[PDB]
Amino acid sequence: KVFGRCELAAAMKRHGLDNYRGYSLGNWVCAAKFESNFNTQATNRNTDGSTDYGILQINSRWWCNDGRTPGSRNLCNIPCSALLSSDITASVNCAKKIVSDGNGMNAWVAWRNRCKGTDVQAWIRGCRL
Template sequence: MKILSLPALLFSLVSVSEAKKFQRCEVTTTMRKAGLDLYYGYSLENWICMAYYGSKFNSGAVSGSNRHGSQNYGIFQISSRWWCSDGKGKTANGCRIPCSKLMDDDLQDDILCAKRIVRDRKRRMNA
């Protein structure tokens, strides 16, 4: 009986992150705490607007293929061509992150990548 209960115990200890459709207030609070308000001159409203119109606050959002065969991932719709690696094609992987990490309910890595993107002189929020 102890052998059967061990796998159940181990399974219950594993934390599984899944995609999530966030509420506006939840996203706003998370972004504010992460220091996005006025980060590189972009207001919190800019970040909220981008996340809403990009993904409808859905961390599991994935776009169709872009003209280069890349896709956009997560709440900020971050491109696999430049910023994350989806293992499907050529990427610069500027955020040094697998795209799958942008599709879970933990927004911290998404926010770190978004901060990296707006620090890029050529792209900023236009990316």
């Protein structure tokens, strides 16, 4: 599923992501924009053989199981396929564990390089929330 900007902000907010670990809604929507262009089906193979999945491009090296990332963990206890669902519940739940890991949203390199320190409220501007 490809979410609309306001549609995804509402869904993230309904699943408790708004201000989770102190990160306002616009941070999450910005990160989703750059990671997947709001497409729950997004996948990207990494140099190390791991793969990133879903709206927030969650990586199989630590977070989910795909059966093909040697020596990896599955910290969210989910098959990576769950992160591709139209229903963002698994992506959000897992993102909560990742953002809680110590480096906050810096875990998402694209958030650090494209969202961090920018006017992230623009991502939720005009949305009924």
